[PDB]
């Protein structure tokens with residue numbers, strides 16, 4: 001999810 | 008003139024990092040989503056916990072209100088969106104069709120459609136009443152970080168790790184514009200301005216930009232914050248002074264003068280990255296939310 005997600 | 012945002016309430020309850028906070032259009036409620044797979048509802052003015060809405064199988068990255076404040080839509084790593092009746096807590100529809108994590112979501116102004124973006128590199132348009140996928144746009148070549156309808160719902164803006172912002176015709180699915188500046192960093196957030204004339208885009212080079220999307224021109228740059236890693240939301244504050252509001256990877260909320268681009272305030276108190284901020288529709292109230300080492304939401308209030 002957004003809370004750990006990086007590119 | 009500068010605002011005087013002061014901490015009024017800290018909201019504890021999520022058991023993991025908070026992913027998104029949004030005020031209801033009617034000003035009564037704050038909705039929060041979390042990596043803990045839950046949605047929580049809080050009083051917008053007193054921060055009083057109202058209730059928990061559950062049903063996703065994995066973490067939630069985004070939640071959004073319908074324009075009548077009756078429904079929520081959530082986007083999850085379980086590859087679904089869910090449409091919720093807030094008053095009953097009922098899951099009205101589970102929207103299935105994305106082939107990877109759903110990251111971002113929004114209703115259109117007349118709340119008969121939902122738009123979603125996914126790690127599957129597509130933008131999807133869904134019918135709210137039937138819960139069925141109407142269109143799949145092969146929008147990007149990397150995960151879609153944000154999706155938003157314009158003021159009349161005729162256009163969608165999408166942003167992606169591929170470095171692009173794209174404008175889509177809601178009716179045809181045609182790509183009407185691609186926006187990129189002189190460098191190609193991942194685009195981590197985008198939305199239309201309240202008046203529908205501009206898009207505000209975040210890139211993972213510590214930069215927010217205000218674009219005239221019809222001219223395809225960058226009109227304003229906001230800098231001073233830290234944003235190289237996470238998909239941090241940004242806001243137009245319109246109740247008092249005209250501000251830009253964003254979280255930051257230095258654990259602060261940043262507030263800029265929209266016209267002058269000067270920082271007018273930094274809000275300190277969170278113990279981890281501020282991933283999400285929201286601005287109350289009628290009162291000078293900011294909600295902020297932070298990642299795994301913090302797990303709280305803060306409500307800040309200003310006289311202007």
Ligand SMILES: *NCCc1c[nH]c2ccc(O)cc12
Pocket residue numbers: 004005006007107126150
């Ligand atoms: N946020 C997880 C890491 C990442 C970056 N780009 C991606 C594309 C597809 C996928 O499953 C994960 C991922």
